Design a protein around this ligand. Sequence first.
Ligand SMILES: Nc1ncnc2c1ncn2[C@@H]1O[C@H](COP(=O)(O)OP(=O)(O)OP(=O)(O)O)[C@@H](O)[C@H]1O
Ligand SMILES: Nc1ncnc2c1ncn2[C@@H]1O[C@H](COP(=O)(O)OP(=O)(O)O)[C@@H](O)[C@H]1O
Ligand SMILES: [Mg+2]
Lengths: 102, 517
Amino acid sequence: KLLIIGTTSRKDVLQEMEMLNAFSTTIHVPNIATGEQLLEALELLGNFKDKERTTIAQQVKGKKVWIGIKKLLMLIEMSLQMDPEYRVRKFLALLREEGASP
Amino acid sequence: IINPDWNFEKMGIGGLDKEFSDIFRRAFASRVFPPEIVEQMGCKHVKGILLYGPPGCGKTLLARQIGKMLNAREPKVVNGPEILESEANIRKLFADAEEEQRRLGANSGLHIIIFDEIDAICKHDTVVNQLLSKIDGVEQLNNILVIGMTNRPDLIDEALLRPGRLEVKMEIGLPDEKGRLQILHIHTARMRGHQLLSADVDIKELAVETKNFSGAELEGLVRAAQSTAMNRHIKASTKVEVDMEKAESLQVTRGDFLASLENDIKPAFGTNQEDYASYIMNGIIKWGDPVTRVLDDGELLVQQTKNSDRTPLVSVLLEGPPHSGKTALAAKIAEESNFPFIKICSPDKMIGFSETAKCQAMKKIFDDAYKSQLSCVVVDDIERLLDYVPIGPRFSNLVLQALLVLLKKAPPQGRKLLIIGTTSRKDVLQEMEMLNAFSTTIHVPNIATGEQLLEALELLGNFKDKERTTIAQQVKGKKVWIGIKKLLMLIEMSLQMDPEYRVRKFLALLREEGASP
Ligand SMILES: Nc1ncnc2c1ncn2[C@@H]1O[C@H](COP(=O)(O)OP(=O)(O)OP(=O)(O)O)[C@@H](O)[C@H]1O
Ligand SMILES: Nc1ncnc2c1ncn2[C@@H]1O[C@H](COP(=O)(O)OP(=O)(O)O)[C@@H](O)[C@H]1O
Ligand SMILES: [Mg+2]
């Protein structure tokens, strides 16, 4: 017996080459698409404090979010470098800059 | 796992408890229990061991300690070129063991032979065959042991590693912060009881600072520091008629460690250096905020990649209009990094090379970079390195795929890296989808205001007061579009005319150039 697992990021190109016929089934992994999920991830990572968490939740609860997990880790690590005063501002600015339509 | 506790600090070994314990359990356990139960087991004694790794980490000292505590005689040593008539020398090593086996062999002691740089004497098939016959020939030597060492195990003959003969292999790699701490704790013993050192000394800082340091370098640190301090205070008190013990009152050492560390001893492994004059010829002159902004962003990136655990790899891309001075800024940041290992890969060294050769050079550079606990590698002119051309495409697909695969491969555990690239054709790169491989982008704009041009001119200091006023009034409008390199060469050309016909020539040259993106 055997089992083969594949990974890809360009589904349409594979579709044109008549490749999906060989594969028996496909599974879809989505991105973060709600403020609640982002807040849960931030809490689980255990980086920001309570007050900054409240500020982030208040500011981010009036827009849409579409971001990948690895990019989120990179943004958190980059933002932590700045001084304690401007960490939240830098993180929010970077999130706004990265924000894009699905 | 259960083990018999040892006192490593007492034996002088630090940071290798696991290796010592495993070696002792797998190799020398049998030869300590009495022959009767050994035979009843059916146990068979091992005959050879192999140790490999960077030089100076202390391969010999491990077996020397085992010999000191082996409750037997001392081990004999051989050298790679010593044997290299050969059979006569071979008969000077096992002849003593053969004589013992003539006088003994059932209850005889244990003889140990040590081979240095064994790879140099085996790959000359005559000596290899003689050695192979001797270790396992028609006669069986049950009172001998061989412990080879080298640094390139891949070059050892396979027949020598057949399971019947040598069967244990180990790697002894460079120390880490905690390992360096323990090694220093061990080496700082005599002066610890002699009170020749200062109480302000912080061994933690010394251990943290030394990135690529072997035990030999660590001991040399202590040697040089004590020498520096003795000379310092003795000489200080010799030229004055002050009390002699005043010098001995300064015997305690706090800053001499740093003094010796500055340039007395330097890392031996990796530790490449690069020249920056060839890439920074006119220095760096501040003509506006953007230079400060770029430098600050580069410094922040350099800081993140040193005190972070979740991001052991960081890449950054610089983009801007041609001749904006991106390569110089990248080289300046790389120099300011202060990392032990630095290198630059540029197409200038690659002239007329084939695509495969370029791929080989790139992979070799990255492979060398992997060897160091820190590094920074710079790649310049990506669009040229791909051999682009506007008339249709001509990119070398192989060179593109090599880069795209390389940019993501993380290093082994515990090693960090930083990658910086510089480009000018951003759209073309975006087309190939490689833009997503990078993590961040920093812009390199061009001069866009007149006052910036006058400030650059005054920093350069070439035009006089009247000429400065004339240019300022002529181009007061903030509708300029010029790069630092273009400004430099334009000024250099314009300076070639006669003193009278210079300002007008400069203005004509500026007008010839563009004024908008
Ligand atoms: N503040 C500065 N910024 C950039 N370059 C400067 C600065 N001060 C002086 N220079 C000099 O300007 C010249 C431009 O630098 P460099 O050769 O790296 O340009 P570039 O835009 O990377 O070139 P290319 O178009 O060939 O890619 C160099 O001589 C550099 O020393
Ligand atoms: N774990 C360790 N404990 C004590 N000393 C060490 C250790 N590792 C390296 N050294 C230092 O390395 C030196 C010995 O290296 P050596 O055995 O000659 O290496 P090789 O024989 O492979 O050239 C000694 O000066 C010793 O202080
Ligand atoms: Mg350049």
